[PDB]
């Protein structure tokens, strides 16, 4: 008897990993898992021509921002059973239990597999040595760019690379996602859809989600983030953190792990940045201190000939054991809440910081067309970085950009 499981590169070995995992169960149940990882630059195209076609596996991993996208689509079996087995709605922070249908949807669609938030990477010795108090830096957006400039006048040089860091790091090439962004929105008091009546519509143009995104888009202006690095993705910005090459940036819980792991096993142990690592949440905006919370949920096609063994990997992967143990291997957090009292978390200060972080966790609403706003967005978002890379994003061209944005999102939004 077989299970197919696609999941995303959540670990250094994804396929070893999630195979180490699920081995228990393999031996319990007499079962062979079968696992295919797909790059998340991929796993929208393969998971929605899996869902249209009626071809793929018994289960996937969905972001939990692609979950109501999916479910509207009518092809994930209702999951309500698992959640019940599990310990139901108590069991799950409330931002992760709407992650587990479509917005408005009487049916669950998808179990809780692991959290993930965001906060600041930091160079402990190039900020010491640039004179930057972390806690002055990440408390507020003035201290932010104060920090910024300090480690732009800093002499420090990194002891490998033998060249000064530049101070802050962010992809301006292949935005596939406003991660990067939505804390800039949010800190502003702007959002990025706002219902009203019954309706969605963009708040990408309102005055706050502009204010938000020209501070964030600015600091590349004012020279705290290089040329270079705005014809960069995500990936390329990670490698560049790696190589000691900026002394701050944004990613989720993952890097920790990977700081802990040599470069030989798909880590970077060995590197100046793995032993001087800090982290620290984003700073408050002038309107509140928010991060980007998301994480990966598990699906069941309605295709699938295996549902009830399907459930049955679903209520072990969602469990106290299976959910601390994937934690571990991949560096992110359990979505279950009880995992999170496990001491193997607590006790990582690191890790610590990003638990304390969750508290202005916020996350995107489940809508059925999410996947056409998030791109309508990245696309001309995309349109603002280039303006930035010449030097010739003003507020005004900015407000052109999203008000088309936002015609754009209104009409997706309108199906
Ligand atoms: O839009 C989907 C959204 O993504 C999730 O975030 C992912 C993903 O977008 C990001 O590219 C991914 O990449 C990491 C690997 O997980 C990590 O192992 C290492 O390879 O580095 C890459 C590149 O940075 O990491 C995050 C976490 O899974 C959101 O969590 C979720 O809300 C989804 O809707
Ligand atoms: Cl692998
Ligand atoms: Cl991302
Ligand atoms: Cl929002
Ligand atoms: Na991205």
Not at 93 to 117: D, K, M, Y
Not at 284 to 297: D, E, L, M, V
Not at 343 to 360: C, V
Request: proline share 7%; net charge positive.
């Amino acid at each position: 008897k077989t299970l197919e499981v696609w999941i995303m590169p959540n670990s250094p070995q994804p396929a070893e990993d999630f195979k180490a995992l699920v081995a228990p169960f393999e031996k319990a149940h007499g079962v062979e898992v079968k696992v295919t990882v797909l790059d998340w630059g991929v796993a929208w195209t393969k998971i929605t021509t899996a869902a249209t076609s009626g071809v793929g596996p018994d289960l996937t991993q969905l972001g939990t921002t692609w979950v109501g996208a999916i479910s509207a689509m009518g092809v994930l079996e209702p999951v309500d059973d698992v959640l019940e087995a599990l310990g139901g709605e108590k069991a799950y922070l409330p931002a992760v239990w709407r992650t587990t249908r479509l917005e408005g949807a009487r049916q669950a669609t998808a179990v809780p597999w692991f959290s993930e938030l965001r906060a600041f990477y930091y160079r402990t010795d190039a900020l010491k040595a640039a004179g930057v108090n972390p806690a002055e830096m990440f408390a507020s957006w003035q201290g932010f760019e104060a920090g910024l400039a300090r480690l732009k006048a800093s002499s420090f040089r990194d002891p490998e690379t033998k060249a000064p860091l530049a101070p802050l790091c962010t992809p301006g090439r292949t935005p596939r996602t406003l991660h990067n962004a939505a804390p800039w929105i949010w800190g502003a008091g702007g959002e990025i859809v706002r219902q009203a009546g019954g309706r969605w519509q963009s708040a990408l143009n309102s005055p706050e989600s502009l204010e938000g995104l020209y501070f964030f888009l600015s600091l590349a202006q004012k020279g705290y983030v290089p040329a270079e690095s705005l014809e960069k993705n995500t990936a390329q910005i990670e490698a560049d953190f790696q190589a000691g090459k900026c002394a701050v940036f944004a990613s989720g819980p993952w890097m920790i792990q990977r700081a802990q792991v040599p470069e030989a096993k798909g880590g970077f142990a060995e590197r100046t940045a793995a032993k001087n690592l800090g982290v620290a949440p984003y700073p408050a905006g002038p309107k509140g201190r928010y991060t980007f919370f998301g994480g990966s949920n598990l699906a069941l096609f309605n295709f699938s000939k295996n549902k009830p063994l399907a459930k049955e990997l679903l209520k072990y992967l969602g469990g106290p054991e299976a959910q601390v143990r994937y934690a571990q291997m991949t560096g992110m957090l359990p979505a279950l809440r009880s995992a999170w009292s496990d001491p193997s978390f607590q006790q990582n200060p690191l890790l610590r910081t990003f638990i304390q972080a969750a508290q202005f966790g916020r996350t995107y609403p489940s809508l059925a067309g999410w996947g056409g706003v998030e791109n309508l967005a990245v696309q001309h978002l995309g349109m603002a970085w280039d303006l930035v890379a010449q030097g010739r994003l003003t507020r005004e061209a900015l407000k052109d950009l999203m008000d088309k944005a936002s015609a754009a999102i209104n009409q997706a939004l309108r199906h």
